[PDB]
Amino acid sequence: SYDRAITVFSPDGHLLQVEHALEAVKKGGCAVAIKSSNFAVLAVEKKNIPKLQNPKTTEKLIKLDEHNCLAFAGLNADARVLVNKTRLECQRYYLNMDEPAPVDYIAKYVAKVQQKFTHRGGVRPFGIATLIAGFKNNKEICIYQTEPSGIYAAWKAQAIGKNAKIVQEFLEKNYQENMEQKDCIFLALKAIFEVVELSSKNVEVALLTEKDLTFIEEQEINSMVELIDQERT
Amino acid sequence: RRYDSRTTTFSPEGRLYQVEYALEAINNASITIGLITKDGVILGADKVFISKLIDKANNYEKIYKIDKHIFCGVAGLNADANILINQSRLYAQRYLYNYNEVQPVSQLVVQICDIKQSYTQYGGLRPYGVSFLIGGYDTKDGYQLYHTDPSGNYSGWFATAIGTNNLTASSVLKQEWKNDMTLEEGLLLALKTLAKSTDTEIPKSEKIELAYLTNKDGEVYQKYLTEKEIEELIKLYTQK
Amino acid sequence: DRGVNTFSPEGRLFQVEYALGAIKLGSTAVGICVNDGVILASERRISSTLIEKDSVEKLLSIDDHIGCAMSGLMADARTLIDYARVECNHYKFIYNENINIKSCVELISELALDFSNLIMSRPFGVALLIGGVDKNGPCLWYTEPSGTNTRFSAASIGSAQEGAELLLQENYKKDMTFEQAEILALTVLRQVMEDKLSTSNVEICAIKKSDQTFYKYNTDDISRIIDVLPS
C-alpha cells in the first residue's frame, strides 16, 4: 500500500520479504560469467518453445552502455525496469563526466536501488540478482554481483539462478587465471551445461571485449556442444 | 490496516499471489489465436455467446486497432482491455507526434508491459487482468507478434494461443504450420485450430471473427472479416 | 498483524528489538580507543576463494579523520556510511573545522531512528562502531539500532562478540600505547577467529593522533603486526 512497510523485520532478525525474493531469484534461469585478462565471457540459459516461439525477441545479454553489460535471473519485467533505470543513470553519469561509466559505479548504484526497494514503503523488493561486467576507469575487467538484499561483492567467476551452488563449486574447482578466449567460452559453456541439458538451443553465450559485446555464432556453439558431448563419454 | 489486501507481496516460496489469480482469469476467457504468415499477420478470436440479441455487426469485442499499423486482441476482462488499449493508442500517437514515425511494436509492448508492471510492483492496487497479442508490421524486422501478460513478461511468437483450451490450440499450431504460408492457408489454419479448441467439427460463422494486416503496395492495410467472408472461408474449409 | 511502530507490553518497540536481533548475525570487528588513536579492525569473512577481496571491505572511511566498522545488514550499513560522510562534508562546507566524532554519531543515530514518523519505513538493522580523532583526542563510539549511542574504551561487534568483549575486559588497561593496542586487537581477533590469522584474512584501519589520517594498513604492515604477536 502507499506509505506502508511491505518488508519488515521478523522475530528472528530476518527480512522475510527479502528472503522470498531470494528463493524467487533461485527459481529463475541460470547465468554464468567468467573474467580473464581484458575480457569477460557471459552466458545465460535460453528457454523457448520450438516451432512456435521466436528466439530473437528473448534477449538476456543486453548491453547497458558502451562498456558495461548486465545479465540477470528471475523476474524478467523487474529486470527490464531496473535496466531502464540503470541505462538512464549511465547516460546521466556519462553526461556529467564525458567519460564512460565504470562497472563499479553502476554496480554500486544497482545495489543502492535494490536496497531502496527493500527499505521504502509501497515498494516490494526487486526479484532479481543482476551481475554487471565491464571495465573500470583504470580499464581493467571486473565483475560484480548484486542481490535483492542490495549486497554486492566483486567476483572472478560467479553464477546465479537454479542450481547455482553446483556451478559455483565447479567454477571454484576448475577456474584458472589468464585464460584464452576459446578456453573462457568453453569453461562458461561447460559450467552452464553442468546444470542444463546439453543442447545448442539453451545457450546464447557472448564475449565482452573493449570494442563491444560480440555474440558467438551458432556454428561455434554447435561445435563446442558436440565436443563437450564427445568428452563426456 | 487490518483490511489490507496486500497485493504487492511475494508468496511463501517465490511468486506474487494475485498475479497467479489474474493468470487464472486469463485461463477462463474466450480463446484467441495468433499467427504469422508470409503475406500478413492473422489474429482470430472466439466470441462468447452472451445472447442471440447481441448486435453481431460491428461489435468486434476481441480484436481492436491501436494504430494505423498496429492491432491487438484480448483474452481477459474487456473493461481493463479498453483502458489499456486506450493507453497503447496514446503512447503510439505520442511517439508518432514526437519522433514523426510509425511506432515499432516492440516499444509499444514494452510500454504496456511497463504499465502492467507498475500495477504489479508499485502501490497496492490490484494488477491488470488481461493478456494481449500485439502484432503488426514495421520496416525494422518485417512482421512481428508478441504475447504480454499481467506479470510484465513478453516474448515473440510465430504462432500462439491464449484463453480456454490453449494447450489444444498450441498442439494444433505445432503440427500444421509452415514458414512459406500464404494468407488463405493461414486463415484455414485459424479456422481449423479455432474449431479444434471449440470442440465443434464445423465452425459456426456467428461464433467467430477474424482479421489480418496486409502490406501490399508498400502500405499497411488492416482488414477485419465480416459474416459473409467468414461464411465463405468456412465453406472453403469444409470443402478441403 | 502490527505496524512498524507499536510498543510491546514491556514498553519496548517490537521492530527495535527485532533489529537488535539482526545485528548479532555478522562479521567480527574489534576496536581499542587508546590515547594514541583508534585501531578499528575487522574479519574479512571470505565467502569463497573466487572472491576478489577488493570490493568486499568492512572498514570504510566516513571522513579522513573518521573510521568505522559495519555489521548486520550490509547495504543498509553502506547507506548509513554514505549519509554520514555526506553530512560530514556538509559540515566541512558550512564550518571550516573538521566534524567531531560525537556530532557524526548523532547524525548517524538520527538517521537510524527516523523510521518512526516523529521517507524511511523500517529501522536500520545495523550496529556501527565509529571511531576517530578530534581536538579532544581519540573517541570511539557505538550505535545499536535502538539509538542509545554510547562511547567505549574498547568494543567488539558481530557474531560471537561475547568472547571478544570478555577478553577485552580481561586484558585492556589504561595508558596503553599504540603498539600494545595493535597486538591486543590481533590477539583478541585470533582468539575469536574460527580460522587461522593469515595476513590477507584481516583488515585494520588506524587514525593516529599526530597524523589524523585514515591509513588502512597494507599487507606488509599486517604481516609485521601478526609476526610480533606472542605465543
Next chain:
Amino acid sequence: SFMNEIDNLINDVENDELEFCVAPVNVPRNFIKYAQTQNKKLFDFHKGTTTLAFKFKDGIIVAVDSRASSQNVEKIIEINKNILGTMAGGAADCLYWEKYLGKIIKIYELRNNEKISVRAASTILSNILYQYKGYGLCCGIILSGYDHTGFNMFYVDDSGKKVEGNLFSCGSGSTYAYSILDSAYDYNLNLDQAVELARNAIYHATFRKVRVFHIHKNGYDKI
C-alpha cells in the same frame, strides 16, 4: 501543525543556509541589475586578480598577483590534492563554487574509490555555473592539474564555457599577458625559465606581490 497552517491561511498572516533567497520583484534575474541603476556602493564586490597558468615539460606553472580594498588576498584554492583552482572576476562567486566543487569531488572520491579527472571537475563546475547563468554571476576559473589521462588545463566561466588547451590567462589586463606569452613561450622550458616567464608576464600585466605555484604529478609545491 496543520492547524497553524490553516489558521495562517485564513488570517492572511504567513531558512537553511544553503537555500538561496530571491527578490519578489517581477523579474528577479535582473533584480541586481535594477539595483545597480539605483546605486553602486553596495555592488562594489572584491574583484579577483589576473591569473596566468600554463603547461610545460615537467609540470604546470600557475602565477597570480595580489590585488583586490585589499592587496594580500589568496587567489588559488585547493580543489583536490592534485587539482588547483584559480580565481578571477567576482571573488565571492568563484571562491564559493570552488569550495563547493571541492566538496563534490571529496564525496565522489569517498564513495567511488578513485581519483577524479580534471575534465570531470571542469564539467561539474561548468554545469553548476550554467545552472545559475542569467541570474547574474561573475566568475573566471582555470582548472589545472594531473589526472590518469595526463595533465589538463581546463578553463571554465560563468557562461558554461569549457575549453581545453595548454595556454590560458583570465582577469583584468589578460590580453597583455597573452601578448607577452605569445611573444615568448615554449613547451620544452626549464622550471627556472618557466617561473621567470610567469613572473615577467604577471609584472607586465599589473603595470599597464606575485604568488606562483608549481603543480607536478605528485601534488604541488609552494615557491
Next chain:
Amino acid sequence: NYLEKLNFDFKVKDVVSIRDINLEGKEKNIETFHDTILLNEEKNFLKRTGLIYGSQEVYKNILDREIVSLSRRLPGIKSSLLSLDIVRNTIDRIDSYEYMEKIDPLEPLSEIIEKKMNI
C-alpha cells in the same frame, strides 16, 4: 528560502530535461498567473468557508478532498477523479482546464513514480 536547497546531490545535468531560465524564481508573467489560477480561487473559497462557518469546515473540506484525490490510479493513465469533482462541486461547471489539452516525453514510467510519491 528559495531556489530549492543544495545538498551535494551531484546530479545537476539530467538526460530528460534542461533547467529553466528562471530556475524557480517564477517571474510574474502570464503563464505564472495562469499556473496559480485554481489554487488562488480555492484559497479564497477556504477563506470564506472557514471564516464564516469555522476552520473545522476547512479542515473537513481539505481532508475530504485529499481522501478522494488519494483514491486515483497510479501515475501514467489519467484518472477520472469524479469523487474530487463531486466534493469540490466542479462537476456542474465546465472550465478551461477541463477542455483543451496538453500533449505530454523523455522520462520512463518508473522515474515518474519515483518523482510523484518519493521512492
Next chain:
Amino acid sequence: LEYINILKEENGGYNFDNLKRNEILKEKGVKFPQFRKTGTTICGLVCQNAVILGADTNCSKLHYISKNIWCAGAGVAGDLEHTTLWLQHNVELHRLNTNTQPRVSMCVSRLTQELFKYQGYKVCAIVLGGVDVNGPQLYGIHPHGSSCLLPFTALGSGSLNAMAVLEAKYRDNMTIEEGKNLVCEAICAGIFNDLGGNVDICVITKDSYQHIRPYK
C-alpha cells in the same frame, strides 16, 4: 494542498510553450499579422415583455445562449466566440442538472466573473439580454467586467450614433414592430454613418423565438 496539484497535472488548460520565442521575435523587430477586429455597431433595448437585440455583419453577430437568451459581441472574434460557446454550454449544463428555465442574472454573473478574472486582456464587450422569470432584462457587460441593467444599450465602434438615436426615440411599453423600427433606426443609421453588411434582428420572447439574419 496536494490534491489541487494532482488536479492540475491530470487536467489540461492553457499551455504556454512559445512565450520566449515570441519575446525574441518581437524584440528583434518584425511586424506580425493583425487580429480580426470584428467590432461593429450592436445595440439592444428592453421592449414590451421581450428583449430585442441588434447587430450587423457575413459574420452573424447574434449568438445563442439559451432559448430565451441571445447576445451580440463586439471586439476580438475568437474571444467572443469561445466565451459565448462557454456561456451557452455552461447554461445548458446547468439547465440539464437543475431542470429550470435559464435566467439572465446567472449569465451576467458568470460573464462578470470570467471577464473580471482577466483584467483587460480579453477584449470582449457583450450586450447580453433576454427574458426570464423576472421579465425582460438587458445588460451592458464591458471588458473590465462591470454589468449594469440598462433600459437600452449600444456598444461598438459606431456606438455614438446608435446611442443618440435610441436616447432620442425610446419609449416605454413599446410595440414589437416599433422596437424593430427603432433597432434599424439605430443600427442602419450607424452603419451608413460610421465607417457594414446586413443588419440582424431577433426578438427574445420567453418561448418560440425567431431569428432574422436577412433583416435588411
Next chain:
Amino acid sequence: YNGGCVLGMSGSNCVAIACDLRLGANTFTTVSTKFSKIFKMNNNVYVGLSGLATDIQTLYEILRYRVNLYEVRQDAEMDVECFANMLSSILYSNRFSPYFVNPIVVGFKLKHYKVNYEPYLTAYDLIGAKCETRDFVVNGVTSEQLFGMCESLYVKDQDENGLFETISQCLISGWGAEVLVLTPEKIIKKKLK
C-alpha cells in the same frame, strides 16, 4: 520570414486548394525553395497552414495526433466541422502567444442519405475566427492582392478543368506553387511554373 499565400475555390461537387512554396529566414534571405504547406489530413480534409515553418510543422503534427486519436477511438470516418472546431480550440489554447500560421480548412460534407458530397470552406485568424463562407475564401499574409482576383474571377459552379484553370490563373512569398484539385472520386496534384 517563411511567409506565403494560400487559396481555395469551390464549385459543383469539387473543391480546389493552392499554395506557394517559399521558406526563408532573416526577413529576406531564401534558404529552401520547396516546403510543404498543404497537408492531407484525411481523404476529405486538407489543411493549408501558411506562416512560420516551425508553426506549420508543429500545428500539423498536433492536428495529426489528435485526428488519428479520434479516428482510432471512433473507428469510423470523421466530419469536417469536428476538425474545424478542433483547430479553433487548439488555436485558442494558445490565446497568449498563438501559433503564427494563417490556417485554411478545406473539406467535403458527407450527408449520409447513399452519401451526398458537398463543399466546405472556412477561413481563420491568428486566434481562431471561424466563418462559414461556402464560396471562395482566401487567407495569407499577401491575401490583400489575392482578394481582387478571388472576387473578380468567381463563376459559381464550374467544371473541374475550368476550376483548375481559374485557380491557376488567379494564383516574402513566391518560388513556385502547387495546386491540389479535390473531387469525390479522385485527387489531382500539379505544380505551376
Next chain:
Amino acid sequence: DTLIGLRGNNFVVLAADTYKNDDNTKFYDIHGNKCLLLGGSIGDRLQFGEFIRKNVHLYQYQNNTDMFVKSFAFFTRKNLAYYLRRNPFEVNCLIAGYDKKDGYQLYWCDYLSNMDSVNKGAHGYGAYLVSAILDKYYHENLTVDEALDIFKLCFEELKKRFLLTQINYELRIMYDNKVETQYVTV
C-alpha cells in the same frame, strides 16, 4: 562561427570554423552514421548537443536499434524548441546523416526550429556569402572531392572578404558507411 553543409548523391559533408583554434565543442558524433553540428555560445552548445546526444544514446541502447535520421532530425527540432522555451538563447542546428530507408540526407534548422530538408545549408555570420557560392556551383551527381573544392573556395572567399587571417576549419565527411574527419587550413 560559420557552419556549412552539403549533401547530394552518396556524400554528406559538414564544415565549421574551429575557433584557441581547435574548437571541439561544435561537432558531436552520434552512435551510428549520424552527426550533430551546432553553433552559438560555447556553454549553450555544450549543453544542448550533449543533451541530444545522450538522449539518442539512451534511445538506441534501451531498444537495441539505430535511430533513423528523419526521426533524429525531428527529435532535435522538438528538443531545440523546448530548449528555447527553457533558455532564451539562439542555437543553430545542421542535422545530417545516413539511413538505409532513404540513403544520405542533410537538414537545416534555425534557432526558431524552422527545420527543413535542403541539399545546401549555411548558418552563422558568413551564411550569406557561402550560400551564393553553393547556389552557383552546386550540381547533381557531385563527387565528394569537388564538393571539398567548393568548400575550399568558400573558405578562400571568406578569407578574402573579411579581415580574418590564419583561419581554420574541420571537415566531417560521410560516405560508403564510413565517417571521416579532417583539418583543412587555408
Next chain:
Amino acid sequence: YSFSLTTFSPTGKLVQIEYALNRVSSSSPALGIRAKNGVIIATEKKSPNELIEENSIFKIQQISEHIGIVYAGMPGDFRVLLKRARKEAIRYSLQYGSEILVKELVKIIASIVQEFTQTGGVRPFGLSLLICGVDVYGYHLYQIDPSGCYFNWMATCVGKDYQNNMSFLEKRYNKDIEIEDAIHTAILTLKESYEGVLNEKNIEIGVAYDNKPFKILTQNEIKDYLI
C-alpha cells in the same frame, strides 16, 4: 494506506463486482428496444408510499439532445454517473462542436466505472447503466455493467427476473419493427414481470425518434399507449 478492496479472489472471478451484480439482480426492471425508426427505453418505477410525487423521482433522464439514459440500481450512483456523463458530453461539445457520439460516451463511462472498480479504497458501482441514442451512424443502445464491460445491445432487460424478460423480448422481437410496435412490446414485457396490476404512474417510457429530440413521454401518452 491506498489498497484495492476489489481484489482477485482464488479461482479469479473478481468477486467484489459480482456482489454488485447481485444488486443489479435485486433491482426493478429497466429495458429498451432499438427500433427501425428510433430507440426506446422503458422502466418500472415503484409506488412505495403512495405519497411520492411521480414527476420528482426521475429514472429515464436525458444527457444530450439525442441521448437518453436509464438504469437499474441505487439512485445516487445513477445521479453522479449522469452528471459526469453530461459533463463529458459538453466537454466533447466544446472540444469538437457537435453532439457526442454514443460510442465515445459509452467508452468514457466504461473507463470511469472500471477506474472506480480498480481504484484503491473505493467499492465498485451498484447499477447497470443502459445508454441509448441517435447519431449520424444511426441508432445505438449500449449497456455499461458494474464491471465496466460495454455491449452493443439491440434489445435487453436488466433487473429482477432479467432472464425471463429477455427471453420474452427475444420471442417477440424482429430487426424490422416500427416505433409503435416497439413501444407495445416494451409495455408487454414490463407488464409480464410486475407482480401486480400495471397502470398509470407505475412505468416511465422514453423515446428518441429518427429526427426529433429525445422526449420522455408524458403520463397521458403512456396511458394512451397502455390501451
